[PDB]
mmCIF file of C-alpha atoms in Angstrom:
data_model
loop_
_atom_site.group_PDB
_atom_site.id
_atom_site.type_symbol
_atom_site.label_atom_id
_atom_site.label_comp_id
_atom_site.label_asym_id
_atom_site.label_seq_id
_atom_site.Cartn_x
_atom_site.Cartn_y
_atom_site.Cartn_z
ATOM 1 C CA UNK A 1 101.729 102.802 75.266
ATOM 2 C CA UNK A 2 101.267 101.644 79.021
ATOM 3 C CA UNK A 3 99.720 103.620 81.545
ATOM 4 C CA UNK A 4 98.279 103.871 85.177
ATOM 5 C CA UNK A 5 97.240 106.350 88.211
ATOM 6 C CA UNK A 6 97.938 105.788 91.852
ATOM 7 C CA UNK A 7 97.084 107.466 94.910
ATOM 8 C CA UNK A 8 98.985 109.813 96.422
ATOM 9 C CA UNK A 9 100.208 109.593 99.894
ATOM 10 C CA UNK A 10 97.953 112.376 100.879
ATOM 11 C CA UNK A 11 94.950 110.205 99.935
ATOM 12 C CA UNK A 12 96.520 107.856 103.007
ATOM 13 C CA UNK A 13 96.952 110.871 105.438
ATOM 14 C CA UNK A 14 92.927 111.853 104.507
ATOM 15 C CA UNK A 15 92.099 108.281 104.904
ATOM 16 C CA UNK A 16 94.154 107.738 108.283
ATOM 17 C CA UNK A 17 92.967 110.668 109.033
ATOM 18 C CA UNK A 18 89.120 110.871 108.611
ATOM 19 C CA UNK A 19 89.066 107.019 109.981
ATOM 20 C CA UNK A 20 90.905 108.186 113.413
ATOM 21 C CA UNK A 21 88.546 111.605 113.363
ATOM 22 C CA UNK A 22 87.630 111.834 116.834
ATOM 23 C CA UNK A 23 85.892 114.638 118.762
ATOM 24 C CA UNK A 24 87.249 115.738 121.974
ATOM 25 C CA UNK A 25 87.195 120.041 121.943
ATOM 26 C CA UNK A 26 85.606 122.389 119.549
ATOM 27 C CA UNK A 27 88.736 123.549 118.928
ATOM 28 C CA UNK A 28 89.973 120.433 117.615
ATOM 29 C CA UNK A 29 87.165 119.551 115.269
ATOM 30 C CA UNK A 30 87.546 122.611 113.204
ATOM 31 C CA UNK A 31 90.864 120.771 112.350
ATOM 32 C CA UNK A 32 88.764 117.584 111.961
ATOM 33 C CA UNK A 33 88.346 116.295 107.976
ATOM 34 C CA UNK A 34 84.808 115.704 107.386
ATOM 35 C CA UNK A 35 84.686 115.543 103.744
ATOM 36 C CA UNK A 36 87.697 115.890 101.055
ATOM 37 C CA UNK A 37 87.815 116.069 96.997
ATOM 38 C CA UNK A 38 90.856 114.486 96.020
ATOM 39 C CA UNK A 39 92.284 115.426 92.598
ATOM 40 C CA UNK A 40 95.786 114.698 90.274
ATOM 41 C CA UNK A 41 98.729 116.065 91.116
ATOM 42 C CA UNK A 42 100.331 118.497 89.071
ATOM 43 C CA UNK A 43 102.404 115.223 87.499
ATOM 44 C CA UNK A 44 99.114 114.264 86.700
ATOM 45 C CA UNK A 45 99.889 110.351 87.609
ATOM 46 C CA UNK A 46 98.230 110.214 91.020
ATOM 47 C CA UNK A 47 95.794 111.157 93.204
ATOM 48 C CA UNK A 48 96.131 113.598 95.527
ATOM 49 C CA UNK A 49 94.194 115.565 97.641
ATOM 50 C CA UNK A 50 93.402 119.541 96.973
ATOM 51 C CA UNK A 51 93.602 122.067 99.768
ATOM 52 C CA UNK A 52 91.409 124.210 97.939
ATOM 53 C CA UNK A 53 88.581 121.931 97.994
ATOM 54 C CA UNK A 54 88.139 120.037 101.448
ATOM 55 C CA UNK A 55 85.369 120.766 104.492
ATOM 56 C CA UNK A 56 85.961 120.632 107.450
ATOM 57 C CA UNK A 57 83.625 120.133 110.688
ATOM 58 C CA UNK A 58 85.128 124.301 111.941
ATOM 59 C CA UNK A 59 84.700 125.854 108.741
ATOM 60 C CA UNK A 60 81.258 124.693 108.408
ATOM 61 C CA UNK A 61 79.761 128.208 110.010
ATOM 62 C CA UNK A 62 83.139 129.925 110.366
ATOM 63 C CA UNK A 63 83.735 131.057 106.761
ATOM 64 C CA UNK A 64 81.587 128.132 105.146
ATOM 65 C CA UNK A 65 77.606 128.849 104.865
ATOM 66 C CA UNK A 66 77.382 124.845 104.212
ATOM 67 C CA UNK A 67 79.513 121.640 103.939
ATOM 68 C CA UNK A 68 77.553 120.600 101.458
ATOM 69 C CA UNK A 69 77.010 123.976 99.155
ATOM 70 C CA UNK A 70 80.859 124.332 99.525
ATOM 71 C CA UNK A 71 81.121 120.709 98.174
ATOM 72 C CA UNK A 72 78.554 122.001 95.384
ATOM 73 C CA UNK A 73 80.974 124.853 94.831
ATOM 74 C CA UNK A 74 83.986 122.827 93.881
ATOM 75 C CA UNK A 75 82.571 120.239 91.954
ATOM 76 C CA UNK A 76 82.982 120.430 88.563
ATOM 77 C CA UNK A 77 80.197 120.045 86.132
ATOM 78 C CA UNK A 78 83.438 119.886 83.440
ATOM 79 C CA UNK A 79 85.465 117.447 85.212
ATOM 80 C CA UNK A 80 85.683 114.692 87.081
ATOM 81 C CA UNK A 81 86.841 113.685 90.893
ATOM 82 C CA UNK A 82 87.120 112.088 94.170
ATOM 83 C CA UNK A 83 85.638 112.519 97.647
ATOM 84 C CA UNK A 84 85.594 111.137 100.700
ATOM 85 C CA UNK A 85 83.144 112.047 103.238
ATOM 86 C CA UNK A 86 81.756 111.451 106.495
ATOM 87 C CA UNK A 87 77.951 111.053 106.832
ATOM 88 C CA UNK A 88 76.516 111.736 110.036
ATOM 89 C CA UNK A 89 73.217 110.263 110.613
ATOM 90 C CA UNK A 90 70.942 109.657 113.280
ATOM 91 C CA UNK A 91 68.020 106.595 113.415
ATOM 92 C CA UNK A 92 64.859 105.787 115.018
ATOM 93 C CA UNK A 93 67.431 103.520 117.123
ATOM 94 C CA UNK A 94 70.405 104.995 117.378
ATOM 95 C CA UNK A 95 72.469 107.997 116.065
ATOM 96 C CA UNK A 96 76.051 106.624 114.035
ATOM 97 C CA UNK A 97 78.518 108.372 111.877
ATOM 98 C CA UNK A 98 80.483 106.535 109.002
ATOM 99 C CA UNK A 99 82.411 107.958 105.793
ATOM 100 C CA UNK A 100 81.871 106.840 101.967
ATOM 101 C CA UNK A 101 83.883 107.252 99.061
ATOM 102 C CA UNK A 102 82.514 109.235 96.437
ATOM 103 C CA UNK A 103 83.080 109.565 92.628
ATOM 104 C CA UNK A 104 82.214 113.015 91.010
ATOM 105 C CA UNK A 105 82.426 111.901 86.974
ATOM 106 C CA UNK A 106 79.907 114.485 85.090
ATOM 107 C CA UNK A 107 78.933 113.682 81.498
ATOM 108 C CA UNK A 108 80.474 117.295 80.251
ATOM 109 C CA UNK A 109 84.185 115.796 81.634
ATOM 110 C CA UNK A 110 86.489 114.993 79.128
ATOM 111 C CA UNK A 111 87.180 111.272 78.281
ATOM 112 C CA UNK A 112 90.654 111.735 79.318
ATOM 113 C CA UNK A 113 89.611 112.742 82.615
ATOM 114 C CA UNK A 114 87.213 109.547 83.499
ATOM 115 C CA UNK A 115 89.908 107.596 82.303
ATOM 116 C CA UNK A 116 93.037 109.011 84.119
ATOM 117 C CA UNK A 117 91.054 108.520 87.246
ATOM 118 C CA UNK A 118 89.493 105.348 86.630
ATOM 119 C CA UNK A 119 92.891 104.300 86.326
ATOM 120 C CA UNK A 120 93.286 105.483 90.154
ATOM 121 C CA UNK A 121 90.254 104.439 90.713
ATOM 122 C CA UNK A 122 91.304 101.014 92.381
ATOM 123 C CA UNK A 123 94.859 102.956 94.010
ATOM 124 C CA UNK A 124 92.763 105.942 95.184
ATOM 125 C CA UNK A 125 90.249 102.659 97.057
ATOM 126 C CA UNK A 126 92.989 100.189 97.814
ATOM 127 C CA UNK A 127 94.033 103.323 100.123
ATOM 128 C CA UNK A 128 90.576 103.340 101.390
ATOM 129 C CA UNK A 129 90.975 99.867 102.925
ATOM 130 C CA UNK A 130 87.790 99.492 105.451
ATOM 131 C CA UNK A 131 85.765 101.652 102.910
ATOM 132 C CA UNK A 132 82.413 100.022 103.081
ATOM 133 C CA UNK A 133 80.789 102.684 101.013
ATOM 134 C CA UNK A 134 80.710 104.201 97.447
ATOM 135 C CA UNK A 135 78.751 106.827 95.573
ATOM 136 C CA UNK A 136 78.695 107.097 92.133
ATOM 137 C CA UNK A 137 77.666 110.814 91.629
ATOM 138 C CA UNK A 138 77.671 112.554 87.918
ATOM 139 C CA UNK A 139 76.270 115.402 88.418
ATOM 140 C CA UNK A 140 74.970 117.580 91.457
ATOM 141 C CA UNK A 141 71.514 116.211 90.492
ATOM 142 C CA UNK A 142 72.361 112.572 91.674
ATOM 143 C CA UNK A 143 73.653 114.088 94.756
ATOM 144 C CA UNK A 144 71.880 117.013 95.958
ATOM 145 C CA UNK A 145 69.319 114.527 97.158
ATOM 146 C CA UNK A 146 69.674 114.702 100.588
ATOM 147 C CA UNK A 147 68.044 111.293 100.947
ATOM 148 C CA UNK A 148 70.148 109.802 97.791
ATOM 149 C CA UNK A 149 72.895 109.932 100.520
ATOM 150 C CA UNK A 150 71.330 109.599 103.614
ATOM 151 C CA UNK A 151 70.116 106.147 101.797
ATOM 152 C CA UNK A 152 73.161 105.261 100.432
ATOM 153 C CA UNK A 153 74.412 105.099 104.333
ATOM 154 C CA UNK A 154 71.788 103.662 106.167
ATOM 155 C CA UNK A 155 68.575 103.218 103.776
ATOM 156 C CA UNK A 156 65.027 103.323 105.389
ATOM 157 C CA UNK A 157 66.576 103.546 108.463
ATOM 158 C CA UNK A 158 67.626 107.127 108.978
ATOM 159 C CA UNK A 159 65.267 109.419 109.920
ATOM 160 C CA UNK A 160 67.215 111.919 109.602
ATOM 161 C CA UNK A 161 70.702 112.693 107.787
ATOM 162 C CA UNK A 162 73.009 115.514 108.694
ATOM 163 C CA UNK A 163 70.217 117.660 110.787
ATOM 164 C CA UNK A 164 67.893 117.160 108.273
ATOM 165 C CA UNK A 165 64.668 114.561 108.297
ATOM 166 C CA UNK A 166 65.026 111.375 105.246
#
C-alpha cells in the first residue's frame, strides 16, 4: 500500500508570489501575501493553499485586528499545517524583511494528519526552493513568542521584530 503528498500548484503561485512581494502603493500591498497556511486539497493528496486562512499586509487593520491573532485564529490545536510567512524585522544595523516556512503539527492532531503532510513535507519545500528558513511550531505556545520568531530570523540581532522590541 504505496503512498505520497505533493504540493499543489497554488503552493508555487504563494511561493512565486510572496518571493516577488514588492511594495510600490498602498493599494497594492493589501493584495500583497504576507503570510499563508497551506492545507490538503479536498483529494486530500496535495498541498494546497486555503483562502480562508491567509494574511495579508491590507487586511491587517482593514477587517483583521492582527496578522498574527488571525494566524492564532486558524491554527488548529486538532490538526496539523503549513505556513509561509514573511518576517519583517528591523536591527541595530539595518532594517530587512525575509519569509520562513512554518510547520503547525500540534500533539492533539491525529497521526494520520502528521503523516499525510510529512509526506508533503519535502513537495510542499522542494516548491519553496530559496527557503532559507523553517519553524517547527506545535502549538501556539512555541510560537506566540514573539522573540521565538524574531530569533528564528535574525537571532540576537533584531531589536525589534514586526513593530515590536526582541
Amino acid at each position: 500500500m504505496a503512498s505520497g503528498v505533493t504540493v499543489n500548484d497554488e503552493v508555487i503561485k504563494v511561493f512565486n508570489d510572496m518571493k516577488v512581494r514588492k511594495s510600490s502603493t498602498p493599494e497594492e500591498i493589501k493584495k500583497r501575501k504576507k503570510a499563508v497556511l497551506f492545507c490538503l486539497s479536498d483529494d486530500k493528496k496535495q498541498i494546497i493553499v486555503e483562502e480562508a486562512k491567509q494574511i495579508l499586509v491590507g487586511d491587517i487593520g482593514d477587517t483583521v485586528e492582527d496578522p498574527y491573532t488571525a494566524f492564532v485564529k486558524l491554527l488548529p490545536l486538532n490538526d496539523c499545517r503549513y505556513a509561509l510567512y514573511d518576517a519583517t524585522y528591523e536591527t541595530k544595523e539595518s532594517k530587512k524583511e525575509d519569509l520562513v516556512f512554518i510547520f503547525w503539527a500540534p500533539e492533539s492532531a491525529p497521526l494520520k494528519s502528521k503523516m499525510i503532510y510529512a509526506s508533503s513535507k519535502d513537495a510542499i519545500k522542494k516548491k519553496f526552493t530559496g527557503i532559507k528558513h523553517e519553524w517547527q511550531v506545535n502549538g501556539l505556545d512555541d510560537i506566540k513568542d514573539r522573540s521565538t520568531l524574531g530569533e528564528k530570523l535574525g537571532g540576537n540581532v533584531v531589536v525589534s521584530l514586526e513593530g515590536k522590541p526582541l
